[PDB]
Design a binder for this molecule. Structure first.
Ligand SMILES: COC1=C2C[C@@H](C)C[C@H](OC)[C@H](O)[C@@H](C)/C=C(\C)[C@H](OC(N)=O)[C@@H](OC)/C=C\C=C(/C)C(=O)NC(=CC1=O)C2=O
Length: 220
């Protein structure tokens, strides 16, 4: 059922990702960029095929800090991924050479994005990463990994996303700060530069008369 990452690829990625230890907050920049790409794709598709947005009529990025469960969620209503794409694109050449040539013969913070491995920076702050996704052409599925092995299963909750993807991070004890609204809001704003889609953070808001209310708060 489960899978294991390629021995050499894993080892090399461990070193690549670890080199970003002085600026771990970049994982959020990468997840936001990924969401932006998924949203650009569904937006382009919707220009000629309006029914493409039927499963969820909105184009947004919504972030939720679940202090109660020690989880950080980054959800987009982009194009989503099929079960095969989760297994194939989050599980697997001599292209590694091209990556270390860029490493040694040449910055890591700007190379991961270009090499298409920025997603893995999530492991800088998380012991486990879960990817829940729903694409128009398939049912909702869940990918899970501890950075060494991974598995994919049909989501028993059914199609709850409508369309899109949720990146769920099980935060390391030393990354509890990322559950704080102020910290998350600050980072989102710092990394919501060229994203042409609204990004929200589920937050507490002043409700008046001493009342506290919760709602999505626009960051860009
Ligand atoms: C150019 O596309 C990108 C690729 C190539 C490829 C895998 C694209 C993918 O093909 C199935 C879909 O077309 C695309 C819409 C899905 C996302 C961007 C997902 O994010 C969300 N929010 O859906 C992301 O989930 C973690 C997919 C894995 C990301 C990896 C391994 C990475 O590190 N960098 C990548 C960032 C990218 O932008 C990357 O490799």
């Amino acid at each position: 059922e489960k899978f294991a990452f390629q021995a050499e690829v894993n080892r090399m990625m461990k070193l690549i990702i670890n080199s970003l230890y002085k600026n771990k907050e970049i994982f959020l920049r990468e997840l936001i960029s990924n969401a932006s790409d998924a949203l650009d794709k569904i937006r382009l598709i919707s220009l000629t095929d309006e029914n493409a947005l039927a499963g969820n009529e909105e184009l947004t990025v919504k972030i939720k800090c679940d202090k109660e469960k020690n989880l950080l969620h980054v959800t987009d209503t982009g194009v989503g991924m099929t079960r095969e794409e989760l297994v194939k694109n989050l599980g697997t050449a001599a292209g590694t050479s091209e990556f270390l040539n860029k490493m040694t013969e040449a910055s890591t913070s700007e190379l991961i994005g270009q090499f298409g491995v920025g997603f893995y920076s999530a492991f800088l702050v998380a012991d486990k990463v879960i990817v829940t996704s729903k694409h128009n052409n398939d049912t909702q599925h869940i990918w899970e990994s501890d950075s060494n092995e991974f598995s994919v299963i049909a989501d028993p909750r059914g199609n709850t996303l409508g369309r899109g993807t949720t990146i769920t991070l099980v935060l390391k004890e030393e990354a509890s700060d990322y559950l704080e609204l102020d910290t998350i809001k600050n980072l989102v704003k710092k990394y919501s530069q060229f994203i042409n889609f609204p990004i929200y953070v589920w937050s507490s808001k002043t409700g008046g008369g001493g009342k506290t209310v919760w709602d999505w708060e626009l960051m860009n």
